[PDB]
Amino acid sequence: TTLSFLIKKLKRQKEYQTLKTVCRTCSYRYTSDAGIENDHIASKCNSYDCPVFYSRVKAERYLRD
Amino acid sequence: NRWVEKWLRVYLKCYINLILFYRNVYPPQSFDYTTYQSFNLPQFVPINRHPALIDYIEELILDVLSKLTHVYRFSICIINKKNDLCIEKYVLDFSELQHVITETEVFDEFRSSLNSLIMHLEKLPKVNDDTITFEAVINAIELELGHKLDRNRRVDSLEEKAEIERDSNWVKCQIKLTSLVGSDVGPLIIHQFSEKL
Amino acid sequence: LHMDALLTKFNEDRSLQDENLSQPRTRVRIVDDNLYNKSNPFQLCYKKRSQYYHIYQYRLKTFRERVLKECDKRWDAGFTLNGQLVLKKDKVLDIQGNQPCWCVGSIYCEMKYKPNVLDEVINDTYGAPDLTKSYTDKESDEIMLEDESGRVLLVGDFIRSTPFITGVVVGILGMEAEAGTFQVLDICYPTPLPQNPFPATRGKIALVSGLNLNNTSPDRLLRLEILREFLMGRINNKIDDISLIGRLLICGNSVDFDIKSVNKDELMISLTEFSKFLHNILPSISVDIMPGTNDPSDKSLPQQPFHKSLFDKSLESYFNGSNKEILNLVTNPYEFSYNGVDVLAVSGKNINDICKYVIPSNDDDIEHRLDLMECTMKWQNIAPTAPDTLWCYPYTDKDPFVLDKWPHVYIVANQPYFGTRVVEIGGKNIKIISVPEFSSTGMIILLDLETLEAETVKID
Amino acid sequence: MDQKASYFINEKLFTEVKPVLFTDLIHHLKIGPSMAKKLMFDYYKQAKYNCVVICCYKDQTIKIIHDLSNIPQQDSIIDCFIYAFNPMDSFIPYYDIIDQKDCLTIKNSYELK
Amino acid sequence: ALRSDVNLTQYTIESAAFNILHKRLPHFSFESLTNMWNAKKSTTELKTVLNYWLSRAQINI
Ligand code: SF4
């Protein structure tokens, strides 16, 4: 039980990290930076025509609960 | 039948895998040394990674375990395709099967039997590819297959379909013997044999 | 000669002495005083769990204050140049003239991402755009200094032969030549941290990492058994020298799997395979367990210890809370005070993530990793890349990754090669050691505590 | 004794087929490592098995001889004893719990409470 | 002109750029753009909104 919970948590965390990485590299087109505040700028992308946004917000909601 | 089912299943799986690998019936590159194949294996045995062979052997072992209630002998044949002649015969005895604990001891016995089998197979000459294939033969006590379809077998679930497809997949049929060590444990009283030429 | 000749020369000439088996030699006592003292720095509350900007601000302020103090200690008034007088500037836009000036401000570079990791992440996002377009659409290779008021192109030669990563605070002092590009003559670094005094019978420490015990590689188990036999004094037979290894330090990567497709059975098998080795090594030599990037723990840097579970039931006598000096499960970063010697060990995720980028400046060898480690030690920041390494809510108003006290030895693991480097910064002495993986080229590092001399042990 | 050891070795080699190591002999006979190596060499003297020998060079280097024909740095060899005897070709040992109540040559400074 | 030529659903700038030019452009709310334009520090936000509008203008061509 505990091992399965840990595995699920690790999968969710890896998915969230991959989504954050791809969104940050996507916003790199505008910021042209890779350091800090890049994810902060990319954290406001509310484009409803991109499926990565829905997956990212779903992962965030799942991690917040 | 509570726990000997899985143990006999993994034993037959390792048996078939080692037989197929050490006799060069399939390319060794398709085999990999592993320990988990949906069941904890007692030794790092070379198991194939092909889907068709996987469920093929799975259904074979399932039918064998279902018929175990009347089967007392299980043989794996190795025959050539240019001529339908038996070249090698590996026998696995099931004398009364000690039918109706310490799983580590069962795993140790299975490991010893598999090591004896590998030692016996290592002394055989190299076997070539190109249609050096294998078969399967069983010996029951009192049973008759191929006659359950006399009422059209109106199906209602998956169990009946599996029973029908298992009872219909069998067809009736008609040197240096080398004995090996089997499993001398209480619940699993299994013996091993072998044939050549 | 043949193997038979060597066997007849060695086994027949066996001494068969000193093996009393009733009065054995006691291992050298080595105690990590940081076990129960106070203030576990990297121990966070998982239940507590953006704060990245808050952390950025505090880090920038601390770094700015330290850089200002270093400038006051180095570029104080009366530090005249060759011909011109030196001056100070508060804003980056203030330095404009034929006079040298010193200013503080962050560094900004390109720091492009690697293409391998790009496709590796792309293959698992369910319809993401071509990230390769994000780098190719733009027209690159230039270092600038941002001080919240502007950016100036830092052109020069002394910057070329130095490594840099965006987000570092530098107090370089130069002078413009023909445009809005400031030259460089010297480079300043923040004030030196206080270091514990080196103490003046003595033992050694064994460091091993990169085990990666998986259900597919059987050679790893053979190497593990060989290492267990060699540490037990059964292989070398030189008890006078083997008993000097007080404890073993597993830095990380003991179990290696792909979290995408794994079940509970494989992890349990690998943990029980490790448990055996553990049960054979424990009653002879102490052990220090540390997690890693491929271990069943958090993927961020400050990883909590694994658990009380995930080990064989026969190890319950060690998890009773009383026998902690025999086996100690610690976080990923830790500052071990081995008999007064402060050594910091990290899983190597920081250096691996820094190398995961492609910087189009600064001109994967051993010297490059050593230089990156030296820069990390000088910058007093263990994690230079915040979002790729660090996680949310690391600390409140006091970051743990910013260095507060310089250690004696900096131990990094999960590296392809092995190497050492003794760096001198502000009259201090730091010895960086690169621990390689145990799966491929499974070398064993033996670190002494009397002269800080590292030795290697190969196992084939 | 050289009599019970050979009996146990041939039993665990032919009756219950499994690779035998000097550690098992030390645990069964309660003897030292050098005595175990001497007994292993004596059993190698006076054949349906495969010997696995290891050689410890200088600089704390340990390797496993595989070709048994080209031994590099034969002058730097400080010790060379037979490690195990396996009847099969693939080594692949197995490890279990061992109760070293009195078969330990190096004891830790701390005792389990 | 895009609706008369192409046959899609959203009829937005980002959807058109992704379905015609194969380029996905992020989208920010008006409040975020205003907060980025009125930041005395953090020139990254100014560069971000500048490149945003420049790309929105070049995609029109
Ligand atoms: S999701 Fe928002 S950020 Fe991530 S790619 Fe699509 S647009 Fe760019």
Coordinates of N, CA and C in Angstrom, one line a residue, chain C residues 39-188:
Chain C
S39 N 19.6 21.0 15.1 CA 19.5 21.8 13.9 C 19.9 20.9 12.6
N40 N 19.0 19.9 12.4 CA 19.1 19.2 11.1 C 18.7 20.2 10.0
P41 N 19.7 20.6 9.2 CA 19.4 21.7 8.3 C 18.5 21.4 7.1
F42 N 18.7 20.2 6.5 CA 17.9 19.8 5.4 C 16.7 18.9 5.7
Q43 N 16.3 18.9 7.0 CA 15.2 18.1 7.4 C 13.9 19.0 7.4
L44 N 13.1 18.8 6.4 CA 11.9 19.5 6.2 C 10.6 18.7 6.5
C45 N 9.5 19.3 6.6 CA 8.2 18.6 6.9 C 7.5 18.4 5.6
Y46 N 7.4 17.1 5.2 CA 6.7 16.8 4.0 C 5.2 17.2 4.0
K47 N 4.6 17.2 5.2 CA 3.2 17.6 5.3 C 3.0 19.0 5.1
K48 N 4.0 19.9 5.4 CA 3.9 21.3 5.2 C 4.0 21.6 3.7
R49 N 5.0 21.2 3.0 CA 5.2 21.4 1.6 C 5.1 22.9 1.2
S50 N 4.6 32.0 -6.5 CA 5.4 30.9 -6.0 C 6.5 31.3 -5.0
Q51 N 6.8 30.4 -4.1 CA 7.9 30.6 -3.2 C 9.3 30.7 -3.8
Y52 N 9.4 30.3 -5.1 CA 10.7 30.4 -5.8 C 11.1 31.9 -5.9
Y53 N 10.2 32.8 -6.2 CA 10.6 34.2 -6.2 C 11.0 34.7 -4.9
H54 N 10.3 34.3 -3.8 CA 10.6 34.8 -2.5 C 12.0 34.3 -2.2
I55 N 12.3 33.1 -2.5 CA 13.7 32.5 -2.2 C 14.7 33.3 -3.1
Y56 N 14.4 33.6 -4.3 CA 15.3 34.3 -5.2 C 15.6 35.7 -4.6
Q57 N 14.6 36.4 -4.1 CA 14.9 37.7 -3.5 C 15.8 37.6 -2.3
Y58 N 15.6 36.7 -1.4 CA 16.4 36.6 -0.2 C 17.8 36.2 -0.6
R59 N 18.0 35.3 -1.5 CA 19.3 34.9 -2.0 C 20.0 36.0 -2.6
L60 N 19.4 36.8 -3.5 CA 20.0 38.0 -4.1 C 20.4 39.0 -3.1
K61 N 19.6 39.2 -2.0 CA 19.9 40.2 -1.0 C 21.1 39.7 -0.2
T62 N 21.2 38.5 0.2 CA 22.3 38.0 1.0 C 23.6 38.1 0.1
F63 N 23.5 37.6 -1.1 CA 24.6 37.7 -2.0 C 25.1 39.1 -2.3
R64 N 24.2 40.1 -2.4 CA 24.5 41.5 -2.6 C 25.2 42.0 -1.4
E65 N 24.7 41.7 -0.2 CA 25.4 42.2 1.0 C 26.8 41.6 1.1
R66 N 26.9 40.3 0.9 CA 28.3 39.7 1.0 C 29.2 40.3 -0.1
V67 N 28.7 40.5 -1.3 CA 29.6 41.1 -2.3 C 30.0 42.5 -1.9
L68 N 29.1 43.3 -1.3 CA 29.4 44.6 -0.9 C 30.5 44.6 0.2
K69 N 30.3 43.7 1.1 CA 31.3 43.5 2.2 C 32.7 43.1 1.6
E70 N 32.7 42.2 0.6 CA 33.9 41.8 0.0 C 34.6 43.0 -0.8
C71 N 33.8 43.8 -1.4 CA 34.3 45.0 -2.1 C 34.8 46.0 -1.1
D72 N 34.2 46.2 0.0 CA 34.7 47.1 1.1 C 36.0 46.6 1.6
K73 N 36.2 45.3 1.7 CA 37.4 44.7 2.2 C 38.5 44.7 1.1
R74 N 38.2 44.7 -0.2 CA 39.1 44.7 -1.3 C 39.3 46.0 -2.0
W75 N 38.1 46.6 -2.5 CA 38.1 47.8 -3.3 C 37.9 49.0 -2.4
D76 N 38.3 49.0 -1.1 CA 38.2 50.2 -0.3 C 38.8 51.4 -0.9
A77 N 38.4 52.6 -0.3 CA 38.9 53.9 -0.8 C 40.5 53.9 -0.7
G78 N 41.0 54.6 -1.7 CA 42.5 54.6 -1.8 C 43.1 53.5 -2.6
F79 N 42.3 52.6 -3.2 CA 42.7 51.5 -4.0 C 42.9 52.0 -5.5
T80 N 43.8 52.9 -5.7 CA 44.0 53.6 -7.0 C 44.5 52.6 -8.0
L81 N 44.1 52.8 -9.3 CA 44.5 52.0 -10.4 C 45.9 52.5 -10.8
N82 N 46.4 52.0 -12.0 CA 47.6 52.5 -12.5 C 47.7 54.0 -12.7
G83 N 46.9 54.5 -13.7 CA 46.9 55.9 -13.9 C 45.7 56.6 -13.4
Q84 N 44.5 56.0 -13.5 CA 43.3 56.7 -13.0 C 42.9 56.3 -11.6
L85 N 42.1 57.1 -11.0 CA 41.6 56.8 -9.7 C 40.3 55.9 -9.8
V86 N 40.2 55.0 -8.8 CA 39.1 54.0 -8.8 C 37.9 54.7 -8.0
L87 N 36.7 54.4 -8.5 CA 35.5 55.0 -7.9 C 34.5 53.8 -7.8
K88 N 33.4 54.2 -7.1 CA 32.3 53.2 -6.8 C 31.0 53.8 -7.5
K89 N 30.1 52.9 -7.9 CA 28.8 53.2 -8.5 C 27.7 52.4 -7.9
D90 N 26.6 53.0 -7.6 CA 25.4 52.3 -7.0 C 24.6 51.7 -8.1
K91 N 24.3 52.4 -9.2 CA 23.4 51.8 -10.2 C 24.3 51.4 -11.4
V92 N 23.8 50.5 -12.2 CA 24.5 50.0 -13.4 C 24.5 51.1 -14.5
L93 N 23.5 51.9 -14.5 CA 23.5 53.0 -15.5 C 24.4 54.2 -15.1
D94 N 25.0 54.2 -13.9 CA 25.9 55.3 -13.5 C 27.3 55.2 -14.1
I95 N 27.8 54.0 -14.4 CA 29.1 53.8 -14.9 C 29.2 54.2 -16.4
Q96 N 29.5 55.5 -16.7 CA 29.7 55.9 -18.1 C 30.7 57.0 -18.1
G97 N 32.0 56.6 -18.5 CA 33.0 57.6 -18.5 C 34.4 56.9 -18.6
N98 N 35.4 57.7 -18.9 CA 36.8 57.2 -19.0 C 37.4 57.1 -17.6
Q99 N 36.8 56.3 -16.7 CA 37.3 56.1 -15.4 C 36.8 54.8 -14.9
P100 N 37.7 54.1 -14.1 CA 37.3 52.7 -13.6 C 36.3 52.8 -12.5
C101 N 35.4 51.9 -12.4 CA 34.4 51.8 -11.3 C 34.1 50.4 -10.9
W102 N 33.6 50.2 -9.7 CA 33.2 48.9 -9.2 C 31.7 48.9 -8.9
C103 N 31.0 47.9 -9.3 CA 29.6 47.8 -9.1 C 29.2 46.4 -8.8
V104 N 28.0 46.2 -8.2 CA 27.5 44.9 -7.9 C 26.2 44.6 -8.7
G105 N 26.1 43.4 -9.2 CA 24.9 43.1 -10.0 C 25.0 41.7 -10.5
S106 N 23.8 41.1 -10.7 CA 23.7 39.7 -11.2 C 24.2 39.6 -12.6
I107 N 24.5 38.3 -13.0 CA 25.0 38.0 -14.3 C 23.9 37.3 -15.0
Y108 N 23.7 37.6 -16.3 CA 22.7 37.0 -17.2 C 23.3 36.4 -18.4
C109 N 23.1 35.2 -18.7 CA 23.6 34.5 -19.9 C 22.5 33.8 -20.6
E110 N 22.9 33.0 -21.7 CA 21.9 32.3 -22.5 C 21.4 31.1 -21.8
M111 N 22.3 30.1 -21.5 CA 22.0 28.9 -20.8 C 20.9 28.1 -21.6
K112 N 21.2 27.7 -22.8 CA 20.3 26.9 -23.6 C 20.2 25.4 -23.0
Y113 N 19.1 24.8 -23.3 CA 18.9 23.4 -22.8 C 19.5 22.4 -23.8
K114 N 19.8 21.2 -23.3 CA 20.3 20.2 -24.2 C 19.2 19.6 -25.1
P115 N 19.6 19.1 -26.3 CA 18.6 18.5 -27.2 C 18.2 17.1 -26.8
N116 N 19.1 16.4 -26.1 CA 18.7 15.0 -25.6 C 17.6 15.1 -24.6
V117 N 17.7 15.9 -23.6 CA 16.7 16.1 -22.6 C 15.4 16.7 -23.2
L118 N 15.6 17.5 -24.3 CA 14.4 18.1 -24.9 C 13.5 17.0 -25.5
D119 N 14.1 16.1 -26.3 CA 13.2 15.1 -26.9 C 12.8 14.1 -25.8
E120 N 13.7 13.9 -24.8 CA 13.3 12.9 -23.7 C 12.1 13.4 -23.0
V121 N 12.0 14.7 -22.7 CA 10.8 15.2 -22.1 C 9.6 15.3 -23.1
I122 N 9.9 15.7 -24.3 CA 8.9 15.8 -25.3 C 8.1 14.5 -25.5
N123 N 8.8 13.4 -25.5 CA 8.1 12.1 -25.7 C 7.1 11.7 -24.7
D124 N 6.9 12.5 -23.6 CA 6.0 12.2 -22.5 C 5.2 13.4 -22.1
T125 N 4.6 14.1 -23.0 CA 3.8 15.3 -22.7 C 2.4 15.3 -23.4
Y126 N 2.2 14.3 -24.3 CA 0.9 14.2 -25.0 C 0.6 15.5 -25.8
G127 N 1.3 15.7 -26.9 CA 1.1 16.8 -27.8 C 1.6 18.1 -27.4
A128 N 2.9 18.2 -27.3 CA 3.6 19.5 -27.1 C 4.2 20.1 -28.4
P129 N 4.4 21.4 -28.4 CA 4.9 21.9 -29.7 C 6.4 21.6 -29.8
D130 N 6.9 21.9 -31.0 CA 8.4 21.7 -31.3 C 9.2 22.7 -30.4
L131 N 9.8 22.2 -29.4 CA 10.6 23.1 -28.5 C 11.9 23.5 -29.3
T132 N 12.3 22.8 -30.3 CA 13.4 23.2 -31.1 C 13.2 24.5 -31.8
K133 N 12.0 24.8 -32.1 CA 11.7 26.1 -32.7 C 11.9 27.3 -31.7
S134 N 11.8 27.0 -30.4 CA 11.9 28.1 -29.4 C 13.3 28.6 -29.4
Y135 N 14.3 27.8 -29.8 CA 15.7 28.2 -29.8 C 16.2 28.6 -31.1
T136 N 15.6 28.1 -32.2 CA 16.1 28.4 -33.6 C 15.4 29.6 -34.2
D137 N 14.3 30.0 -33.7 CA 13.6 31.2 -34.2 C 14.4 32.5 -34.0
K138 N 15.0 32.5 -32.8 CA 15.8 33.7 -32.5 C 17.2 33.7 -33.3
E139 N 17.7 34.9 -33.4 CA 19.0 35.1 -34.1 C 20.2 34.6 -33.2
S140 N 22.7 35.8 -28.0 CA 23.2 34.5 -28.3 C 24.3 34.1 -27.4
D141 N 25.5 34.6 -27.8 CA 26.8 34.4 -27.0 C 27.3 35.7 -26.5
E142 N 26.8 36.1 -25.3 CA 27.2 37.4 -24.7 C 26.8 37.3 -23.2
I143 N 27.7 37.9 -22.4 CA 27.5 37.9 -21.0 C 27.2 39.4 -20.6
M144 N 26.1 39.6 -19.8 CA 25.7 40.9 -19.4 C 25.5 40.9 -17.9
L145 N 25.5 42.1 -17.3 CA 25.3 42.3 -15.9 C 24.1 43.2 -15.7
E146 N 23.1 42.6 -15.0 CA 21.9 43.2 -14.6 C 21.9 43.6 -13.1
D147 N 21.6 44.9 -12.9 CA 21.5 45.4 -11.5 C 20.2 46.1 -11.2
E148 N 19.1 45.6 -11.8 CA 17.8 46.1 -11.6 C 17.6 47.5 -12.2
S149 N 18.6 47.9 -13.0 CA 18.5 49.2 -13.6 C 19.0 49.2 -15.1
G150 N 19.5 48.1 -15.6 CA 20.1 48.1 -16.9 C 21.0 46.9 -17.1
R151 N 21.4 46.7 -18.3 CA 22.3 45.6 -18.7 C 23.5 46.2 -19.5
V152 N 24.7 45.7 -19.2 CA 25.9 46.1 -19.9 C 26.6 44.9 -20.4
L153 N 27.1 44.9 -21.6 CA 27.8 43.8 -22.2 C 29.2 43.7 -21.6
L154 N 29.5 42.6 -20.9 CA 30.8 42.4 -20.2 C 31.7 41.7 -21.2
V155 N 32.4 42.5 -22.0 CA 33.3 42.0 -23.0 C 34.7 42.0 -22.3
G156 N 35.5 41.0 -22.6 CA 36.8 40.9 -22.0 C 37.4 39.5 -22.2
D157 N 38.7 39.4 -21.7 CA 39.4 38.1 -21.8 C 39.4 37.3 -20.5
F158 N 39.4 38.0 -19.4 CA 39.3 37.3 -18.1 C 38.0 36.6 -17.9
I159 N 36.9 37.1 -18.5 CA 35.6 36.4 -18.4 C 35.6 35.1 -19.3
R160 N 36.4 35.1 -20.4 CA 36.4 33.9 -21.2 C 36.9 32.7 -20.5
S161 N 38.0 32.8 -19.8 CA 38.6 31.7 -19.1 C 38.1 31.5 -17.7
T162 N 36.7 31.6 -17.5 CA 36.1 31.5 -16.2 C 34.7 30.9 -16.5
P163 N 34.2 30.0 -15.7 CA 32.8 29.5 -15.8 C 31.8 30.4 -15.1
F164 N 30.6 30.5 -15.7 CA 29.5 31.3 -15.1 C 28.2 30.7 -15.4
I165 N 27.2 30.9 -14.5 CA 25.9 30.5 -14.6 C 25.0 31.6 -14.2
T166 N 23.9 31.8 -14.9 CA 23.0 33.0 -14.7 C 22.5 32.9 -13.2
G167 N 22.3 34.1 -12.6 CA 21.9 34.2 -11.3 C 23.0 34.4 -10.2
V168 N 24.3 34.4 -10.7 CA 25.4 34.6 -9.7 C 25.6 36.1 -9.6
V169 N 26.0 36.5 -8.4 CA 26.3 37.9 -8.1 C 27.8 38.1 -8.2
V170 N 28.2 39.1 -9.0 CA 29.7 39.3 -9.2 C 29.9 40.8 -9.0
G171 N 31.0 41.1 -8.4 CA 31.4 42.5 -8.2 C 32.5 43.0 -9.0
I172 N 32.5 42.6 -10.3 CA 33.6 42.9 -11.2 C 33.7 44.5 -11.4
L173 N 34.9 44.9 -11.6 CA 35.2 46.3 -11.7 C 36.0 46.6 -13.0
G174 N 35.5 47.4 -13.9 CA 36.1 47.7 -15.1 C 35.9 49.1 -15.6
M175 N 36.0 49.4 -16.9 CA 35.8 50.7 -17.5 C 35.5 50.6 -19.0
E176 N 34.5 51.3 -19.4 CA 34.1 51.3 -20.8 C 35.2 51.8 -21.7
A177 N 35.3 51.3 -22.9 CA 36.3 51.7 -23.9 C 35.8 52.5 -25.0
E178 N 34.8 52.0 -25.8 CA 34.3 52.8 -26.9 C 32.8 52.7 -27.1
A179 N 32.0 52.0 -26.1 CA 30.6 51.9 -26.3 C 30.1 51.6 -24.9
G180 N 28.8 51.2 -24.8 CA 28.2 50.7 -23.6 C 28.6 49.3 -23.2
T181 N 29.9 49.0 -23.3 CA 30.4 47.7 -22.9 C 31.5 48.0 -21.9
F182 N 31.3 47.5 -20.7 CA 32.3 47.6 -19.6 C 33.3 46.5 -19.7
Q183 N 34.6 46.9 -19.6 CA 35.7 46.0 -19.6 C 35.8 45.4 -18.2
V184 N 36.8 44.5 -18.0 CA 37.0 43.8 -16.8 C 38.5 43.7 -16.5
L185 N 39.0 44.0 -15.3 CA 40.3 43.8 -14.9 C 40.5 42.8 -13.8
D186 N 39.6 42.8 -12.8 CA 39.6 41.9 -11.7 C 38.2 41.4 -11.5
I187 N 38.0 40.3 -10.8 CA 36.7 39.7 -10.5 C 36.7 39.4 -9.0
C188 N 35.6 39.9 -8.3 CA 35.5 39.7 -6.9 C 34.5 38.7 -6.6

